[PDB]
């Protein structure tokens, strides 16, 4: 799955993403691609390169497509599908889009289809959130960075007490016992639906991570975003059951989202 770095033409700087600078470019001059230059010393390179090869086999219309890697040089390059509208979090925050609620539900649906596919391959995302989803030129949302938190060397991102750990997207059993499962991705998906319907607000926006972890242990939850109907709110709320085995699967969530789309749309 090695891409010859000479087949790449760099056209525009997209900014600093998670763990490296990204550029827009062409592969063989004709095909649009995004090129991420992995920050040196930020990943467990041998483990990361071993997993990157297995992930080229994961393919779904709602997963950002991995095209190949350039590892015969440093920094390492990762070549993927170009997502012209950038990260979902910044896309939600641009008030000029004047999103209809049908568009917000379609974004949830896109992510849910990607997660149902990863769940079918017994593959955990481990850091699902709007900052990790990307948006293409047609407004289609796709999931990225699935499983990458495992190769991050900086301890501030890795452990529950860390300053960069996704406390606001974590269920009680993750915060208390480091119990990761498909049900911790389900909880994070409910939080992501909340981010979409809140147009990119920070979950628990008036709390610190420490206060959020206490609110959750007491059984308290995020409350209904103004743009979410009662039926949409029931779906995101079902992801936050205190008991992990009572939370739905991504297949069940997909069926519920499609039912609401047919009813409302
Ligand atoms: C090449 O570009 C990317 C690659 C990956 C990536 O490598 N993902 C990945 C890789 C693997 C593995 F194979 F390496 F293991 C497994 C799973 N996922 C993830 C995201 C991008 C990526 N990052 C950005 C922007 C960076 C600046 C910020 C700031 C503002 C904005 O919109 N941003 C988004 N993009 C923009 C457009 N297209 C992209 N594909 C992309
Ligand atoms: C027009 N056409 C002929 C040219 C096609 C355009 C083309 O070749 N492109 C577009 C830009 C980068 C470059 C590129 N694409 C890929 C790729 C694409 C799709 C699938 C897939 O869909 N896999 C699936 N597996 C299972 C189900 S679907 C698997 C691999 C790869 C690759 N593996 N290494 C190197 C370069 N690569």
From Swiss-Prot:
Disease: X-linked agammaglobulinemia: Humoral immunodeficiency disease which results in developmental defects in the maturation pathway of B-cells. Affected boys have normal levels of pre-B-cells in their bone marrow but virtually no circulating mature B-lymphocytes. This results in a lack of immunoglobulins of all classes and leads to recurrent bacterial infections like otitis, conjunctivitis, dermatitis, sinusitis in the first few years of life, or even some patients present overwhelming sepsis or meningitis, resulting in death in a few hours.
Expression across tissues: Predominantly expressed in B-lymphocytes.
Outcome of mutating residue 36 to E: In XLA; loss of phosphorylation of GTF2I
Positions of post-translational Phosphoserine modification: 210, 229, 265
Domain (Protein kinase): residue spans on this chain: 8-261
Residues reported in the UniProt entry to bind clofedanol: 80-83, 148
Binding annotation for dasatinib: 80-83
Effect of residue 131 to Q: In XLA; severe; disturbs ATP-binding
Subunit architecture: Part of a complex composed of EEIG1, TNFRSF11A/RANK, PLCG2, GAB2, TEC and BTK; complex formation increases in the presence of TNFSF11/RANKL. Binds GTF2I through the PH domain. Interacts with SH3BP5 via the SH3 domain. Interacts with IBTK via its PH domain. Interacts with ARID3A, CAV1, FASLG, PIN1, TLR8 and TLR9. Interacts with MPL/TPOR.
Annotated protein name in UniProt: Tyrosine-protein kinase BTK
Full protein: residues contained: 395 to 659 of 659
Positions that bind ATP: 14-22, 36
Residue numbers carrying Phosphotyrosine: 157, 223
Free-text comment on this protein's domains from its UniProt entry: The PH domain mediates the binding to inositol polyphosphate and phosphoinositides, leading to its targeting to the plasma membrane. It is extended in the BTK kinase family by a region designated the TH (Tec homology) domain, which consists of about 80 residues preceding the SH3 domain.
Modification(s) after translation: Following B-cell receptor (BCR) engagement, translocates to the plasma membrane where it gets phosphorylated at Tyr-157 by LYN and SYK.
Effect annotated for changing residue 173 to K: In XLA; severe
Localization per Swiss-Prot or TrEMBL: Cytoplasm; Cell membrane; Nucleus; Membrane raft
Family in the record: Belongs to the protein kinase superfamily. Tyr protein kinase family. TEC subfamily.
Entry function: Non-receptor tyrosine kinase indispensable for B lymphocyte development, differentiation and signaling. Binding of antigen to the B-cell antigen receptor (BCR) triggers signaling that ultimately leads to B-cell activation. After BCR engagement and activation at the plasma membrane, phosphorylates PLCG2 at several sites, igniting the downstream signaling pathway through calcium mobilization, followed by activation of the protein kinase C (PKC) family members. PLCG2 phosphorylation is performed in close cooperation with the adapter protein B-cell linker protein BLNK.
Active site residues per record: 127
Motif (CAV1-binding): 187-194
Consequence when changing residue 195 to G: In XLA; moderate; interferes with substrate binding
